[PDB]
C-alpha cells in the first residue's frame, strides 16, 4: 500500500520500525485499545491492532500509520514509530497526558471554582484551528473534527491541544458534525472541516456536552437541512458564537477558511469582554 501527502509518496518501508524488545506497555487508556508505554526512556501511547482481525482491518491500521507519520505540525500528534513486524501490531504516538478533550472538558468543568477559564478554551480552539489550517493548506480533509478526536499534552496550564485520530480519513456516521452537502451528497471539501470545527467550538464552549442535546441523528439531519442551528452554549460570548454561526453557513462558499477562523479566534482572545466572562459553575 502507497500513500501520498505534500507531494511525496510513502509506503510501509518508510515507517520507523522500533524493535519490539524496546517497547514496554504500562497501562490501558481507552478504546482497538490504546496503552501508555515506554520506548528505551520515551513515554508513548501505543495503539494496538487485535491479532484477530480482517485483512481490511490490517490495511486500515497500516494506512493510519502512514497518514500520521507524514504529518509535521505542532498541533498534530507525532508518530514516534511503529512495531508492525511482531504481533500484535503497534503504532507509537506522542503520549498526550491531558487525555482526550471531550473527557478533559467534562472532568475539568468548574465545580464549587476556577479549574478553567474562557482563555483556556480559546487557546484549545486556536490550537485545533492551527492544526486544521495545516491540513487545509496541504489539501487533507479530516472528515471528523470533534472533541473526542483531540488530545491535550498535559492536564494543567501550558497544555497544547492536538488532532489525534485520523480514522475517518450509516448509523456510525458522525451526522452531528457534518454539513448538509456532506451527509446529503457525500461531497467533502475543506469547507466540510470548517463546519465540523464550528461544532467542535460548541463542544468546547459547552464544556463537553453532546451537540444538539436531545436530538437523534435523523432529527439533527432534518433540523440542520431546514436551517436549524444550535443555540449558544451557557455564558458563551457573542463573538465566539458568531464564529460558530459563520462555520455553519448553509453554502460552503459562505463559510470561512481556517486562516479566517484563526484570525477571529485571535480577536476574541484580545477582547477583555470575552476573556473576563465567567464560565458556568455546575
Ligand atoms: C494519560 O494519557 C491519556 C489519558 C487518557 N485518559 C483520560 C481520562 C480518563 N478518565 C480518568 C477519570 N476516570 C474516572 C474516567 C476515565 C482516563 C484516560 C486518555 C488518553 C491519554 N493519552 C493519549 N495519548 C495519545 C493518544 Cl493517540 C491517545 N489516544 C486515545 C486514547 C483514549 C481514547 C481515545 C484516544 P484517540 C483521540 C481516539 O486516539 N491517548
UniProtKB/Swiss-Prot annotation:
What sequence ranges are listed for the domain Protein kinase?
A: 23-274
Q: Look up what happens after changing residue 140 to C.
A: In NBLST3; somatic mutation
Per the record, what is the consequence of mutating residue 140 to V? In NBLST3; somatic mutation
Describe, from its UniProt entry, the tissues in which this protein is expressed: Expressed in brain and CNS. Also expressed in the small intestine and testis, but not in normal lymphoid cells.
Active-site residue list: 144
Disease association reads: A chromosomal aberration involving ALK is found in a form of non-Hodgkin lymphoma. Translocation t(2;5)(p23;q35) with NPM1. The resulting chimeric NPM1-ALK protein homodimerize and the kinase becomes constitutively activated. The constitutively active fusion proteins are responsible for 5-10% of non-Hodgkin lymphomas.
Free-text note on domains in this protein's UniProt record? The EGF-like region drives the cytokine specificity for ALKAL2.
Q: Which family does it belong to?
A: Belongs to the protein kinase superfamily. Tyr protein kinase family. Insulin receptor subfamily.
Q: Function, please?
A: Neuronal receptor tyrosine kinase that is essentially and transiently expressed in specific regions of the central and peripheral nervous systems and plays an important role in the genesis and differentiation of the nervous system. Also acts as a key thinness protein involved in the resistance to weight gain: in hypothalamic neurons, controls energy expenditure acting as a negative regulator of white adipose tissue lipolysis and sympathetic tone to fine-tune energy homeostasis.
Q: Can you say what this protein is called?
A: ALK tyrosine kinase receptor
Q: Which organism is it from?
A: Homo sapiens
Shown part of the complete sequence: 1094 to 1400 of 1620
Amino acid at each position: 500500500p502507497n500513500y501520498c501527502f505534500a507531494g511525496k509518496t510513502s509506503s510501509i518501508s518508510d515507517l520507523k520500525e522500533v524493535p519490539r524488545k524496546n517497547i514496554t506497555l504500562i497501562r490501558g487508556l481507552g478504546h482497538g485499545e490504546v496503552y501508555e508505554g515506554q520506548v528505551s526512556p520515551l513515554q508513548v501511547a501505543v495503539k494496538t491492532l487485535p491479532e484477530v482481525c480482517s485483512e481490511q482491518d490490517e490495511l486500515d491500521f497500516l494506512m493510519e500509520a502512514l497518514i500520521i507519520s507524514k504529518f509535521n505540525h505542532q498541533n498534530i500528534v507525532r508518530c514516534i514509530g511503529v512495531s508492525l513486524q511482531s504481533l500484535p501490531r503497534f503504532i507509537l504516538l506522542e503520549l498526550m497526558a491531558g487525555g482526550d478533550l471531550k473527557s478533559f472538558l467534562r472532568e475539568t468543568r468548574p465545580r464549587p471554582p476556577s479549574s478553567l477559564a474562557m482563555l483556556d478554551l480559546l487557546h484549545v480552539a486556536r490550537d485545533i484551528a492551527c492544526g486544521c489550517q495545516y491540513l487545509e493548506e496541504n489539501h487533507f480533509i479530516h472528515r471528523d473534527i470533534a472533541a473526542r478526536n483531540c488530545l491535550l499534552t498535559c492536564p494543567g496550564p501550558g497544555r497544547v491541544a492536538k488532532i489525534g485520530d485520523f480514522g475517518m480519513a450509516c448509523a456510525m456516521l458522525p451526522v452531528k458534525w457534518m454539513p448538509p452537502e456532506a451527509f446529503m451528497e457525500g461531497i467533502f471539501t475543506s469547507k466540510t472541516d470548517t463546519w465540523s470545527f464550528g461544532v467542535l467550538l460548541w463542544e468546547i464552549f459547552s464544556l463537553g456536552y453532546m451537540p444538539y442535546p436531545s436530538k437523534s441523528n435523523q432529527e439533527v439531519l432534518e433540523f440542520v437541512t431546514s436551517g436549524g442551528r444550535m443555540d449558544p452554549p451557557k455564558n458563551c460570548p457573542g463573538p465566539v458564537y458568531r464564529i460558530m454561526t459563520q462555520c455553519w453557513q448553509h453554502q460552503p462558499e459562505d463559510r470561512p477558511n481556517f486562516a479566517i477562523i484563526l484570525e477571529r479566534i485571535e480577536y476574541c482572545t484580545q477582547d477583555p469582554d470575552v476573556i473576563n466572562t465567567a464560565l458556568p459553575i455546575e
